């Protein structure tokens, strides 16, 4: 489920087929093959729609909740997103290069840019980044047009 993104939806992908044929399997090895099944289910106002589906419908309100996390559980693994964007003396010395290293990392935090990431988590990265690229300048401009109608008047 959470461990593998591809593992989680495969039970779900068959589930919409499964859930109805779970109703089609009761008292029959296969729905078409067994004559015993077709009396058990009712064409209208069936018993499964009476208790099992409402219990499932009760579940759906929580299933869609856990699926919502399950989609997140799948999404986190494929793409991780968190909050947007003598020897003892040597170990003390080793910390100095370690101290030298984070300042490079601190510098490496803004070396590519300090104006773009700080002023924009996502400007050209996949989510909405192509959208500003698709439009002339930036997706904010639509928030700038509706008052242009008031500007021209």
């Amino acid at each position: 489920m959470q461990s593998l993104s591809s593992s989680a939806p495969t039970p779900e992908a068959i589930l919409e087929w499964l859930q109805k044929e779970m109703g089609y399997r009761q008292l029959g090895p296969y729905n078409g093959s067994s004559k015993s099944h077709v009396p058990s289910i009712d064409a209208i106002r069936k018993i499964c729609r009476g208790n099992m589906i409402p219990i499932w419908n009760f579940l759906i309100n929580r299933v869609k909740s856990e699926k919502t996390v399950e989609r997140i559980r799948r999404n986190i693994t494929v793409h991780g997103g968190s909050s947007n964007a003598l020897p003892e003396l040597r170990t003390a010395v080793q910390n100095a290069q370690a101290s030298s290293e984070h300042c490079k990392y601190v510098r490496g935090l803004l070396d590519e840019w300090w104006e773009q990431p700080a002023s924009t988590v996502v400007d050209w990265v996949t989510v909405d980044g192509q959208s500003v690229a698709a439009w002339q300048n930036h997706v904010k401009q639509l928030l700038a047009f509706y008052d242009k109608e008031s500007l021209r008047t």
Binding site: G80, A85, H102, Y105, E112, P117, W124, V125
Partner: protein, 102 residues
């Protein structure tokens, strides 16, 4: 040393947990173009200096044209100090041409 470090690892892990995720989404769409847009500026200065050796070689080439003049003693006495000047004239022109490749 056991307590002083592996709090070392606490820092380095915090030094990694955001570093890997933040950089990956940022540089990768722009990493290949990041070097190139200087490389195109690097090669244009490089090719200009290559012709600039050629122009310097042209100054060596015109010295081959100075050789028919160099036989005449009157301008040769001028030429030899001018060739000494030309020798010196190369360096400031060459130091233009040397680092422009770089």
């Amino acid at each position: 040393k056991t307590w002083l470090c592996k709090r070392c690892e606490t820092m380095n892990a915090k030094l990694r947990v955001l570093e890997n995720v933040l950089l990956l989404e940022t540089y990768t769409p722009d990493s290949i173009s990041a070097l190139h847009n200087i490389r195109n500026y690097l090669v244009e200065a490089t090719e200009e200096a290559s012709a600039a050796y050629n122009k310097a070689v042209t100054r060596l080439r015109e010295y081959q044209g100075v050789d028919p003049h160099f036989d005449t003693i009157a301008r040769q006495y001028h030429d030899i100090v001018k060739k000494l000047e030309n020798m010196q004239w190369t360096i400031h022109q060459v130091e233009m041409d040397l680092k422009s490749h770089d």
